[PDB]
Amino acid sequence: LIKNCLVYSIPTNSSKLQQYEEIIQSTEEFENALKEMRFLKGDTTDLLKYARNINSHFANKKCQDVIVAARNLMTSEIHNTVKIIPDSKINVPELPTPDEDNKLEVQKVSNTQYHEVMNLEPENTLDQHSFSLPTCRISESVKKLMELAYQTLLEATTSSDQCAVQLFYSVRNIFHLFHDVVPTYHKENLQKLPQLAAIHHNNCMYIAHHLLTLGHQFRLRLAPILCDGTATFVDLVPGFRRLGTECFLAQMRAQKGELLERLSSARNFSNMDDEENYSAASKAVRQVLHQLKRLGIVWQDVLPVNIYCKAMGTLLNTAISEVIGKITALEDISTEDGDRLYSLCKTVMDEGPQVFAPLSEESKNKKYQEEVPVYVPKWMPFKELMMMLQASLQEIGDRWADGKGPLAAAFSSSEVKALIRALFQNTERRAAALAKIK
Amino acid sequence: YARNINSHFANKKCQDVIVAARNLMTSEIHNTVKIIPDSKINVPELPTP
Amino acid sequence: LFKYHCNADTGKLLFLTCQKLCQMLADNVPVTVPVGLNLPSMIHDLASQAATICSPDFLLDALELCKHTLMAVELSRQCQMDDCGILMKASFGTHKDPYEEWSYSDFFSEDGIVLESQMVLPVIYELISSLVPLAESKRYPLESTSLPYCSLNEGDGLVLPVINSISALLQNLQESSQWELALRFVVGSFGTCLQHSVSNFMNATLSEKLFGETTLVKSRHVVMELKEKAVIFIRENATTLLHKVFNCRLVDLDLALGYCTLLPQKDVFENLWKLIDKAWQNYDKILAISLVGSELASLYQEIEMGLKFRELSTDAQWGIRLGKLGISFQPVFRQH
DSSP states (O other), X not given: OIIIIITTTSOSSGGGSGGGHHHHHHHHHHHHHHHHTTSOSSSOOHHHHHHTTHHHHHHHHHTTHHHHHHHHTTSOOOOOEEEEOSSOOOOOSSOOOOOGGGGGGTTTTTTOOOSTTTTOOOOOOOOGGGSSOOOEEEEHHHHHHHHHHHHHXXXXXXXXXHHHHHHHHHHHHHHHHHHHHHHHHTTTTTTSOHHHHHHHHHHHHHHHHHHHHHTGGGTTTSOTTSSSSSSOOGGGHHHHHHXXXXXXXXXXXXXXXXXXXXXXXXXXXXXXXXXXXXXXHHHHHHHHHHHHHHHHHHHTTTSOHHHHHHHHXXXXXXXXXXXXXXXXXXXXXXXXXXXXXXXHHHHHHHHSTTSOOOSSSHHHHHHHHTOHHHHOTTHHHHHXXXXXXXXXXXXXXXXXXXXXXXXXXHSXXXXXXXXXXXXXXXXXXXXXXXXXOO | OGGGHHHHHHHHHTTHHHHHHHHTTSOOOOOXXXXXXXXXXXXXXOOOO | OTTTOOSHHHHHHHHHHHHHHXXXXXXXOOOOOOTTOOHHHHHHHHHHHHHHSOOTTTHHHHHHHHHHHHHHHHHHHTBOBOSSSXXXXXXXXXXXXXXXXXXXXXXXXXXXXXXXXXXXXXXXXXXXXXXXOOOOSOOOSSOOSSSOOOOOXXXXXXXXXXXXXXXXXXXXXXXXXXXXXXXXXXXXXXXHHHHHHHTTSSOHHHHHHHHOSHHHHHHHHHHHHHHHHHHHHHHHHHHHHHHHHHTSSSOOHHHHHHHHTTSOSTHHHHHHHHHHHSOSSOHHHHHHHHHHHHHHHHHTTOHHHHHHHHHHHXXXXXXXXXXXXXXXXXXXXXXX
């Protein structure tokens, strides 16, 4: 009887609650007759205790049909992406405006006629880039969840206070469930697919951005139990960021753990005169650039422009600072070595800036492809080490500029001395050059 | 080159519709849409005689 | 079982295991933890796995457990912990992190007094045991143990010990300057406490014939008293958090704007001007305050204050521009 008759008799609207009273009465006589007919022993059974719980049996329904509808669209293995325009953001269906009784103090303001104001346009400027949402690709599930939450919040405003409070805390529960379901269910696909990590990061930064202004948009329309400041969503903002960051860097360390491995065949960049040591060195360098090319293609038009460029610069910094350390730790560099080391460095500069592709159109790529040193911090030392590889001793002395030139700011004096000793043989000219360098 | 304006016309009209295709064909971003058997995309109103 | 036997029974088993783990930790039983596994992290992961694939009837209890296991994990992360390896938080601020400081430094962070773990975990796990009682009996549809059917007589109620447990941890978090955590633990606990009384007792026509009138009056009084406490506490939390946000070098404007919405309507700007009166020691702080004030005035649809905030922002920008050189903008700043 409970699982087939009393479950479906529970109303879905608070207006129909009173009509349930007869069901409470009609059950009791059904309880009494079986007591007079000796079909029961006691007085209180589970058939009557379930009927008296109609209060909770109401809430535990209204607070689950909005939760199950969320988790239904959260465990789907089908992935979709939608682009977010900074100007156009989803708005609530028309906000509940207050009554006209508060318009007595409003019509006295909308009666002034001014013409000296429209004739003057202040030139004051603002840095509005710090309060918008940059272009990104968010999963359609997150957008549908946000629209469901907006609909639930709108519906809570046109009902009794019990339903409003239950729906508001069910909306809070929706994000609480989101914070724990997606990372656990997609555990396999957040390690092997670089695109999904960026998609998850974008979803978190979208939800965190919306949660900041979600509370204020319904501050004066809910019940007075929630109109003073307790109803808010700021507390969850710090957590979601940490959810969107740690997941992304887990992809970074996985990628770095490849590049260095692809450099394991570099053989410490020694004995370049050997043909095998040249071939095995070219093998590592081709694959290092190829990995970054494919990764940038995968991340193209997914991450925002700033973070994509910063992550690419960060990966390239680790790619270049290992080769720089290998070169600066060498001992013998002959004339043949000074040519092949420059040849290996040539490919990196030829196809380095060519990896950056923050947008889809080819014309927009070259604008960002020329600001590589702004993002990559160790670009200048590698440029200097390039042109030192075939520079003469007197040219090195000139470019040192007595500790004031680009080479002085690039490396350290002892490093330059060691590199010169590895480059030039034991001559009095080398001693004079070392005396020039302090 | 000026006397070839015939072909230079066609080789334009026959490429702006091709490049626009290959542009949307090499994208690495994947999306899926469900197809309902009853509702199929129709041409904008057909040219009647 | 979670890898090979994904179904409702596995979810129920995982929920029971996670329930028993919290009870065992609450009873101060020393259990040998293998080296390399975080205990609160493993509790939270088990709760999440139970919540993902559980039946719709167990979904609410699993979600309630997940809401609090994450809070326990966050409390543990602020404490120096062992038996998993090295989990000392001060090891993070001692040196600069290459990978992290372009996706972390853009957001506000708070570093206060290090929390001692002996006073945190036993209280919070006993709270978890109290909030989610051990349930093994048959569950009829539309029933739970976190939004239950219970009477509130003179002194009868499960919320009463929970209030004292929250109060014990709240004062501890106050003196440790853990305001960022305190706001979340206040809001999350207040929501559950409000629901525990709301879920039954505002359908007056139906409630009187099932529980009487005096119980309704008692619930009405208790809700008002708890709300009056919470309103006063939230304002004091938010003011201090707002004070601490702006003192940083790279001020997080996005989070400061969110923190500004907690205060009442008319007293935000009144505070902000006071904040600009403790200002003019650094123009960058003035610009950061002016941007937030302009954004909040626009959000409040207050056109009049927006012009003043924009003029102040322009004055701060000109002051910074002149401070780059040797020109001083002091004598005329914030005048006509």
